[PDB]
Amino acid sequence: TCEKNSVLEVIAYSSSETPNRHDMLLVEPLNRLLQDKWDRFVKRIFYFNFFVYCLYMIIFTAAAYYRPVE
Amino acid sequence: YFSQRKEYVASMVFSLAMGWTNMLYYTRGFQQMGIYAVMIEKMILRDLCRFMFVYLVFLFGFSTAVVTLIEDGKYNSLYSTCLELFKFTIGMGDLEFTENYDFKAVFIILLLAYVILTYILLLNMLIALMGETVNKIAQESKNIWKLQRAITILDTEKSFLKCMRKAFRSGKLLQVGFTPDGKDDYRWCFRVDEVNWTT
Amino acid sequence: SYTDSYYKGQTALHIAIERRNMTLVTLLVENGADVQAAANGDFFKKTKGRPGFYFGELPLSLAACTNQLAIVKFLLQNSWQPADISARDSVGNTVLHALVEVADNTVDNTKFVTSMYNEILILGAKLHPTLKLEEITNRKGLTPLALAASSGKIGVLAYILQREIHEPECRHLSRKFTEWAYGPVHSSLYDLSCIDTCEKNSVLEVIAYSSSETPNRHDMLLVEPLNRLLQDKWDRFVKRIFYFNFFVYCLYMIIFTAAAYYRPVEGLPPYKLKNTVGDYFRVTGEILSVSGGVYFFFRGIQYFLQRRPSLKSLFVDSYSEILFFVQSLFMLVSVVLYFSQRKEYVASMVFSLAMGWTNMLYYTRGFQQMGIYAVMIEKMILRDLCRFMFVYLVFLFGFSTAVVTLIEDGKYNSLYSTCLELFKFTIGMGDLEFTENYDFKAVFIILLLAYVILTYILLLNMLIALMGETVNKIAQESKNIWKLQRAITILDTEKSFLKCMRKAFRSGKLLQVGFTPDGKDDYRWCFRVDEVNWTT
């Protein structure tokens, strides 16, 4: 919580030119923060979104397959 | 679809293919399975993108040579000729030399030169480079995976689509409580336990 | 003390020992502190999903884990309140089990853990000559040697199996005993107790039947007594039995093959026997084939009941047993359909026959040269194809449904032929005959060429590079893998043996010391080993 620009946003949304983009997340407070957030609520939401996307694709597939030929 | 054109089918079909292929986005963030997604991304963005120009140079040069040589046969059109030569590159040719046109030997020399140049030399060069890319990051998954996970977390926090912002980790705890003035600090401190077996 | 869920049982004595304050320990013990109290908080217990300091919950083990020899000497030897050197925690671990537990196979760890272990043993023998701490088993039924073998504590095994004490009145604790030495060569006797004949849980059982997560599972068989013991066991009797079993299996497969080939072509089984030689030999082959299937079936059930493997390691270990069991299942299903008046038994029989030959590769395990290929195929099937299946199926299903959406009444317009045809395109055995009359031809060509490029060029070579990485990653590991397979084969041959005899002792019932603390003399089934070292 920064209200202007937090550390995690800066690391994550970096431009991929930063030399140590991967190692910055190994610093212990950040690693524990990400693990806690993952286990706490994010993991379930991610799985839920994956499931919903799968249902969306199944419906799209079934709808397209039975298109009319007139 | 609403413009009264059959061609909507074509657009729909392409979307459907992407609709399944983009499912691989959800393999990102698994320690085992995100490696395939990132390998595909790196390979498509670097290696095929660069190699496209070399292969297109060879394809166009030999294609225009062949179209110039042949006078009214099956090859004498750039579309079919380019298709056939592309099939030759991936090892899907015929090489049936039982035709009745003049300059047969020149056609054979050109086509065999193309086959050796594309099927044996260039494609294997490409495959060696792609294998180098694949093995370069096979060990890097432990580094890569966390980063992917990190991005997801911020997005799931960023939108969150319920108006709640319970993004804090622990209580509004007091660290010191004695600033240089008479006030006291509470800083949302987060507790961490760590282990080190040294000495 | 602390009465919470986390620090439960911690008292001032634990704190003083943890702080390395000998004075506070001495004063607290002098003041009537309990030196045998159990610290059983969640912080102080063995656990996976929380940090902690497991040490065995006792002050004596706390000093022992922390490398404070003076404190353990005081706690055992003080008259104010002596400690019980054989005290057991809630897990049943003693000080020795705690010492083994806190090892991690590093140099300084190995040094001080080995030293403290030795000192505890010497103090126990001198103070309590009738007490044998190493015979004490924890709640899992493990002695400290069994615990060390289970956890992969290579350094602790290297110490224990080759332990020699050059001090009188405690030589009976030694396991290695040196008989003679020449310039480069010397011969010693090794105790060998509870290496192979234990009746509860031997070292070789624990090494062989470990769950493959133990980091040093391969190196533990290189510790010298085990290496020579297994080599002699191989050369003595196991080698001939293994070759005999391989030969018998070959005969079984030949008979099954011949019987399957000459099946009758009439409908509606079962088929009646005619008074002719062909029918007699055919039904003989059928009976032997079904007999072998039943044999493998019951062996598989016995294996699963004896091991009780978990799901997550069900295929990582027990691969060959699973495949033999699946073969036997196909044989039984073939029998059931045969007597159910169905032709479809042929189909089941065919699958079993194919597996029947392929599982022959199990017998290449245990050769230095040919064993490498079976394990390479095992790793490549379990690791690489299983993961890559989902990616390839995503591509296959996406493009297949795209194509079947596009085509109106052609050869393509059905997912079965389209999936087959696109699979042929994946392995580079398509046709690409674009001389048809369907509309949207250009869109179709774009889609199919995109699929062909994506699968045949990009994905398949990614798979092949990863498989090559797997292949070379274990090409140099052939020695270790061969050793482990050899050990498993030896133990399996010793277990069953089909004659009720177990004359698998390595050497005679020899005497090592013969001078116990009491007036008895000990014989311990010692094992003579001669070794050569050109150092200096």
Ligand SMILES: C=C(C)[C@]12C[C@@H](C)[C@@]34O[C@](Cc5ccccc5)(O[C@@H]1[C@@H]3C=C(COC(=O)Cc1ccc(O)c(OC)c1)C[C@]1(O)C(=O)C(C)=C[C@@H]41)O2
């Ligand atoms: C139950 C499993 C795991 C399994 C059973 C069958 C279907 C199997 O395909 C797999 C999946 C498969 C199918 C096709 C191509 C690749 C993988 O792998 C084995 C299984 C795998 C094989 C390949 O054989 C090997 O790995 C050789 C081998 C390696 C190590 C061993 O210890 C061993 O001794 C038993 C044999 C043989 C088959 O059983 C067979 O003969 C047929 C027709 C298919 C193979 O499914």
Ligand code: NA
């Ligand atoms: Na080919």
